[PDB]
Tab-separated table of C-alpha atoms in Angstrom:
chain	number	residue	atom	x	y	z
A	1	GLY	CA	-19.781	-51.410	8.883
A	2	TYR	CA	-22.825	-52.074	10.252
A	3	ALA	CA	-23.563	-49.349	13.520
A	4	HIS	CA	-24.099	-52.721	15.353
A	5	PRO	CA	-23.107	-55.808	14.277
A	6	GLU	CA	-22.645	-56.879	18.221
A	7	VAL	CA	-26.352	-57.613	17.791
A	8	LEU	CA	-26.188	-59.678	14.790
A	9	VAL	CA	-24.525	-63.370	15.550
A	10	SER	CA	-23.414	-65.914	12.501
A	11	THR	CA	-24.832	-69.410	12.704
A	12	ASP	CA	-21.291	-69.913	13.017
A	13	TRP	CA	-21.030	-68.096	16.343
A	14	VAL	CA	-24.839	-69.730	17.235
A	15	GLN	CA	-23.332	-73.373	16.389
A	16	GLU	CA	-20.506	-72.135	19.065
A	17	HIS	CA	-22.640	-71.248	22.019
A	18	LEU	CA	-25.319	-73.936	22.058
A	19	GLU	CA	-23.921	-74.845	25.467
A	20	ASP	CA	-23.008	-71.118	26.869
A	21	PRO	CA	-24.898	-71.236	30.100
A	22	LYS	CA	-25.865	-67.802	29.543
A	23	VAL	CA	-26.989	-68.126	26.039
A	24	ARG	CA	-30.987	-69.015	25.025
A	25	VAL	CA	-31.647	-69.647	21.676
A	26	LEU	CA	-35.687	-68.922	20.743
A	27	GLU	CA	-37.110	-69.688	17.099
A	28	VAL	CA	-39.584	-67.362	15.995
A	29	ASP	CA	-42.056	-68.364	12.749
A	30	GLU	CA	-44.639	-67.189	11.433
A	31	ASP	CA	-45.254	-70.696	10.734
A	32	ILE	CA	-45.786	-71.770	14.504
A	33	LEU	CA	-45.375	-75.735	13.757
A	34	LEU	CA	-42.405	-75.638	11.915
A	35	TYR	CA	-40.172	-75.720	15.216
A	36	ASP	CA	-42.029	-79.287	15.896
A	37	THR	CA	-40.013	-80.907	13.093
A	38	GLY	CA	-36.212	-79.998	13.890
A	39	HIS	CA	-34.758	-76.949	15.790
A	40	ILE	CA	-31.235	-75.569	16.596
A	41	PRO	CA	-29.805	-78.004	19.669
A	42	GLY	CA	-31.385	-76.241	22.999
A	43	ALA	CA	-33.890	-73.662	21.007
A	44	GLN	CA	-37.049	-73.010	22.319
A	45	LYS	CA	-40.247	-72.009	20.471
A	46	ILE	CA	-41.977	-68.925	20.598
A	47	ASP	CA	-45.666	-68.958	18.905
A	48	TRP	CA	-46.060	-65.172	18.332
A	49	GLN	CA	-49.678	-64.820	18.755
A	50	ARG	CA	-50.210	-67.323	22.003
A	51	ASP	CA	-46.789	-66.150	23.410
A	52	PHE	CA	-46.860	-62.229	23.013
A	53	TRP	CA	-50.281	-60.784	22.459
A	54	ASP	CA	-53.361	-60.483	24.596
A	55	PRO	CA	-55.773	-63.290	24.495
A	56	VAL	CA	-58.429	-60.996	23.713
A	57	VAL	CA	-57.272	-57.031	23.113
A	58	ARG	CA	-55.136	-55.985	20.356
A	59	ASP	CA	-51.978	-55.305	22.178
A	60	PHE	CA	-48.844	-57.172	23.372
A	61	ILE	CA	-49.170	-59.027	26.575
A	62	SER	CA	-48.014	-56.835	30.054
A	63	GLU	CA	-44.619	-56.401	31.057
A	64	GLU	CA	-45.653	-58.924	34.258
A	65	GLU	CA	-46.782	-61.135	31.998
A	66	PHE	CA	-43.269	-60.901	29.492
A	67	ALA	CA	-41.719	-61.728	32.970
A	68	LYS	CA	-43.145	-65.337	33.264
A	69	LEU	CA	-42.563	-65.993	30.237
A	70	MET	CA	-38.765	-65.319	30.450
A	71	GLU	CA	-38.805	-67.303	33.548
A	72	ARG	CA	-40.396	-70.232	31.818
A	73	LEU	CA	-38.163	-70.107	28.752
A	74	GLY	CA	-35.183	-70.008	31.254
A	75	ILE	CA	-34.312	-66.334	30.522
A	76	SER	CA	-33.157	-63.919	32.808
A	77	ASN	CA	-31.862	-60.183	32.869
A	78	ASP	CA	-28.504	-60.786	32.083
A	79	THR	CA	-29.489	-63.278	29.053
A	80	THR	CA	-27.760	-63.788	26.004
A	81	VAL	CA	-31.151	-63.935	23.630
A	82	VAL	CA	-30.993	-65.083	20.559
A	83	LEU	CA	-33.504	-65.158	17.648
A	84	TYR	CA	-33.963	-66.773	14.200
A	85	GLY	CA	-36.780	-67.881	12.118
A	86	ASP	CA	-37.928	-68.931	8.823
A	87	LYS	CA	-38.683	-66.009	6.116
A	88	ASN	CA	-35.189	-64.240	6.063
A	89	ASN	CA	-35.786	-63.244	9.831
A	90	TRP	CA	-39.197	-61.661	9.192
A	91	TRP	CA	-40.735	-62.977	12.642
A	92	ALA	CA	-37.375	-63.299	14.392
A	93	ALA	CA	-36.973	-59.414	14.005
A	94	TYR	CA	-40.525	-58.696	15.481
A	95	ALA	CA	-39.501	-60.827	18.652
A	96	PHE	CA	-36.458	-58.349	19.267
A	97	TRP	CA	-38.531	-55.441	18.796
A	98	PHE	CA	-40.614	-56.977	21.264
A	99	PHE	CA	-37.820	-57.773	23.587
A	100	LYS	CA	-36.170	-54.597	23.361
A	101	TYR	CA	-39.818	-52.873	23.623
A	102	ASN	CA	-39.226	-54.821	27.292
A	103	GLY	CA	-35.844	-53.357	27.749
A	104	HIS	CA	-33.856	-56.737	27.433
A	105	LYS	CA	-30.372	-55.601	27.087
A	106	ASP	CA	-28.677	-58.698	25.192
A	107	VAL	CA	-30.523	-59.579	21.920
A	108	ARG	CA	-28.958	-60.790	18.881
A	109	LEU	CA	-30.524	-61.959	15.894
A	110	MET	CA	-28.746	-64.995	13.886
A	111	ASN	CA	-28.107	-63.349	10.153
A	112	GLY	CA	-29.663	-65.607	7.535
A	113	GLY	CA	-32.379	-66.933	10.086
A	114	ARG	CA	-33.147	-70.786	9.707
A	115	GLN	CA	-33.083	-71.058	5.990
A	116	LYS	CA	-28.546	-70.700	6.462
A	117	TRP	CA	-28.554	-73.227	9.136
A	118	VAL	CA	-30.703	-75.617	7.422
A	119	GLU	CA	-29.016	-74.752	4.139
A	120	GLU	CA	-25.759	-75.008	5.623
A	121	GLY	CA	-26.435	-78.556	7.367
A	122	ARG	CA	-25.830	-77.729	10.911
A	123	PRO	CA	-27.066	-79.705	13.831
A	124	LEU	CA	-31.255	-79.932	13.702
A	125	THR	CA	-33.495	-81.956	16.678
A	126	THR	CA	-36.689	-82.516	17.502
A	127	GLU	CA	-35.863	-82.831	21.167
A	128	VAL	CA	-37.470	-79.586	23.195
A	129	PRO	CA	-35.369	-78.697	26.222
A	130	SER	CA	-35.767	-78.323	29.677
A	131	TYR	CA	-34.162	-75.119	31.556
A	132	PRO	CA	-34.411	-74.222	35.104
A	133	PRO	CA	-36.454	-71.047	35.692
A	134	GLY	CA	-34.826	-68.177	34.830
A	135	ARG	CA	-34.851	-65.368	37.314
A	136	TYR	CA	-36.277	-62.275	35.250
A	137	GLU	CA	-37.242	-58.937	37.145
A	138	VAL	CA	-40.394	-57.401	35.583
A	139	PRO	CA	-39.479	-54.705	32.637
A	140	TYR	CA	-40.521	-51.150	31.869
A	141	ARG	CA	-42.114	-50.812	28.309
A	142	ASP	CA	-39.965	-48.600	25.950
A	143	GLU	CA	-42.143	-46.744	24.498
A	144	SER	CA	-39.454	-44.668	22.362
A	145	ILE	CA	-39.560	-47.263	19.900
A	146	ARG	CA	-43.680	-48.326	18.804
A	147	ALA	CA	-45.884	-45.316	17.438
A	148	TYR	CA	-49.318	-45.153	18.038
A	149	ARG	CA	-52.684	-43.852	15.746
A	150	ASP	CA	-52.553	-40.690	17.654
A	151	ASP	CA	-49.150	-39.873	16.909
A	152	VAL	CA	-49.192	-40.099	13.347
A	153	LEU	CA	-50.706	-36.647	12.476
A	154	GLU	CA	-48.038	-34.883	14.217
A	155	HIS	CA	-45.743	-37.099	12.695
A	156	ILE	CA	-47.581	-36.083	9.212
A	157	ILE	CA	-46.692	-32.534	9.251
A	158	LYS	CA	-42.999	-33.442	11.092
A	159	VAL	CA	-42.879	-35.507	7.817
A	160	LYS	CA	-43.164	-32.189	5.814
A	161	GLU	CA	-41.156	-29.682	8.263
A	162	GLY	CA	-38.428	-32.520	6.924
A	163	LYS	CA	-37.902	-33.314	10.684
A	164	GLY	CA	-39.471	-36.722	10.545
A	165	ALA	CA	-39.917	-39.716	7.746
A	166	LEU	CA	-42.552	-42.391	7.153
A	167	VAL	CA	-41.314	-46.272	5.865
A	168	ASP	CA	-44.008	-48.766	4.242
A	169	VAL	CA	-42.194	-51.650	4.205
A	170	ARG	CA	-45.428	-53.451	2.092
A	171	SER	CA	-45.319	-53.974	-1.157
A	172	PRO	CA	-45.749	-51.330	-4.032
A	173	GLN	CA	-48.508	-51.737	-5.077
A	174	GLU	CA	-50.128	-51.841	-1.504
A	175	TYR	CA	-48.411	-48.538	-0.997
A	176	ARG	CA	-49.907	-47.218	-3.764
A	177	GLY	CA	-53.594	-47.513	-3.183
A	178	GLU	CA	-54.232	-50.995	-5.182
A	179	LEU	CA	-53.759	-52.950	-2.494
A	180	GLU	CA	-55.202	-58.116	7.577
A	181	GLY	CA	-57.925	-56.301	5.337
A	182	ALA	CA	-58.439	-52.777	5.513
A	183	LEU	CA	-61.609	-50.597	4.091
A	184	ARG	CA	-58.853	-48.031	2.428
A	185	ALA	CA	-55.818	-48.220	-0.138
A	186	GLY	CA	-53.132	-46.404	-0.288
A	187	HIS	CA	-50.697	-45.161	2.394
A	188	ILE	CA	-50.019	-42.485	5.304
A	189	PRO	CA	-49.468	-39.117	3.651
A	190	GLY	CA	-45.465	-38.849	3.108
A	191	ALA	CA	-44.708	-42.252	3.530
A	192	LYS	CA	-41.797	-43.645	1.194
A	193	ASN	CA	-42.151	-47.153	-0.099
A	194	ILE	CA	-38.828	-49.327	0.863
A	195	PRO	CA	-40.348	-53.054	0.519
A	196	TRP	CA	-38.103	-54.902	3.442
A	197	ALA	CA	-36.973	-57.748	1.468
A	198	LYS	CA	-35.004	-55.442	-0.555
A	199	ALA	CA	-32.884	-55.484	2.892
A	200	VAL	CA	-31.811	-59.297	2.281
A	201	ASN	CA	-29.560	-61.172	0.220
A	202	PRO	CA	-31.264	-64.372	-1.726
A	203	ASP	CA	-29.579	-67.036	0.715
A	204	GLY	CA	-31.739	-64.609	3.388
A	205	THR	CA	-28.257	-62.465	5.361
A	206	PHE	CA	-28.624	-58.571	5.488
A	207	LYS	CA	-27.094	-56.833	2.760
A	208	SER	CA	-24.142	-54.390	3.618
A	209	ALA	CA	-24.186	-51.421	5.606
A	210	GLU	CA	-23.327	-49.890	2.753
A	211	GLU	CA	-26.403	-51.654	0.356
A	212	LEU	CA	-28.943	-51.077	2.915
A	213	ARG	CA	-27.927	-47.164	3.496
A	214	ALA	CA	-28.638	-46.802	-0.493
A	215	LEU	CA	-32.241	-47.971	0.243
A	216	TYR	CA	-32.939	-45.275	2.711
A	217	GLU	CA	-30.682	-42.180	2.051
A	218	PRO	CA	-31.185	-41.521	-1.712
A	219	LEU	CA	-35.029	-40.921	-0.438
A	220	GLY	CA	-34.789	-38.550	2.327
A	221	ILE	CA	-34.908	-40.957	5.050
A	222	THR	CA	-31.957	-40.428	7.327
A	223	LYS	CA	-30.953	-40.298	10.593
A	224	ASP	CA	-31.440	-36.507	11.920
A	225	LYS	CA	-34.554	-37.426	11.601
A	226	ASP	CA	-37.579	-38.762	13.696
A	227	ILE	CA	-38.463	-42.215	11.821
A	228	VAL	CA	-42.012	-44.526	11.661
A	229	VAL	CA	-41.988	-47.617	10.354
A	230	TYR	CA	-44.987	-49.639	9.039
A	231	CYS	CA	-46.655	-52.314	7.477
A	232	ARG	CA	-50.334	-54.049	7.845
A	233	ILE	CA	-49.199	-55.433	11.518
A	234	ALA	CA	-46.188	-54.911	13.961
A	235	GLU	CA	-44.771	-58.602	13.093
A	236	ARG	CA	-44.365	-57.011	9.470
A	237	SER	CA	-42.819	-53.919	9.945
A	238	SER	CA	-40.158	-54.639	12.717
A	239	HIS	CA	-37.609	-56.147	10.315
A	240	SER	CA	-37.097	-53.339	8.447
A	241	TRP	CA	-37.321	-51.071	12.086
A	242	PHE	CA	-33.940	-53.131	13.097
A	243	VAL	CA	-32.849	-52.615	9.530
A	244	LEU	CA	-32.847	-48.895	10.411
A	245	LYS	CA	-31.766	-48.896	13.995
A	246	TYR	CA	-29.625	-51.316	14.913
A	247	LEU	CA	-27.790	-52.240	11.642
A	248	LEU	CA	-27.459	-48.293	10.040
A	249	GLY	CA	-27.728	-46.797	13.428
A	250	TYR	CA	-30.618	-44.486	12.921
A	251	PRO	CA	-31.251	-43.079	16.292
A	252	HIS	CA	-34.607	-42.549	16.228
A	253	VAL	CA	-37.189	-45.280	14.997
A	254	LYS	CA	-40.933	-46.364	15.843
A	255	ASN	CA	-42.526	-49.238	14.786
A	256	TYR	CA	-46.429	-48.425	14.216
A	257	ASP	CA	-47.789	-51.686	15.274
A	258	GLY	CA	-51.241	-50.649	14.795
A	259	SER	CA	-49.761	-50.106	10.817
A	260	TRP	CA	-52.295	-50.165	8.143
A	261	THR	CA	-54.900	-52.876	9.441
A	262	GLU	CA	-55.616	-49.927	11.629
A	263	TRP	CA	-55.051	-47.203	9.499
A	264	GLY	CA	-57.253	-48.047	6.911
A	265	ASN	CA	-59.714	-49.232	8.836
A	266	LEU	CA	-59.489	-45.771	10.852
A	267	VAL	CA	-62.567	-43.347	10.245
A	268	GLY	CA	-61.437	-40.041	8.920
A	269	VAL	CA	-57.996	-40.372	9.055
A	270	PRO	CA	-55.588	-38.607	6.092
A	271	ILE	CA	-54.263	-41.160	3.198
A	272	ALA	CA	-52.245	-40.541	0.125
A	273	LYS	CA	-52.572	-43.194	-3.142
A	274	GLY	CA	-50.301	-43.458	-6.117
A	275	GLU	CA	-46.458	-42.497	-5.879
A	276	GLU	CA	-44.724	-40.006	-2.693
């Protein structure tokens, strides 16, 4: 089975923990207005750009700001945070990554996302919770899961020595250089293409550990290597990062948040086109 099934909860699990004092459910959607129309009872809304991004520079909010957000959401350090959203949990996986970047110990993703909960006809409400402030100590960012532009060159070499791998989760067209825009098209040299959606079933749930392994192992993307995953922006590569590190247990996996919007616009950086 999965390496970390404990970080994946079912819709049944969530419905039976709607009143757990140690549980805080958050809906994280690409469509920041969807929550307003109806959500899981007791769930709170995360507006990604406004809540996780600095208002002026391209970077996430500070550790201090993260702690204030948590308290406002009634979340404490020992809180079991449960995430779900639209698009096969695309954005919810992003929130998962960000929570882990801030070191939150107990974060879980609802298998199937908003899609499955709605399809099953489980409780929905437009009523928004009013939880008492949480107690969240200032976290320490975990750099082992975030990759930066100045780490790529040395990674590109690691990919050649068979010590690392690059996972491009974009469409094959973008991957090949036929391509959140950029002045250049192609992929980071050495990267392999595994479109993110290949990890999920039509109903929004994740594929089996076996089916997932089959997406990466045959392409040389193995646990013994340091992995770097990217898309156009971090928000879209977090899903595959989650699949590799948590569902498949890869110990070294980083999310390159800069992704193509940064790389494809950088001056004088290596770029490969075609297949690899």
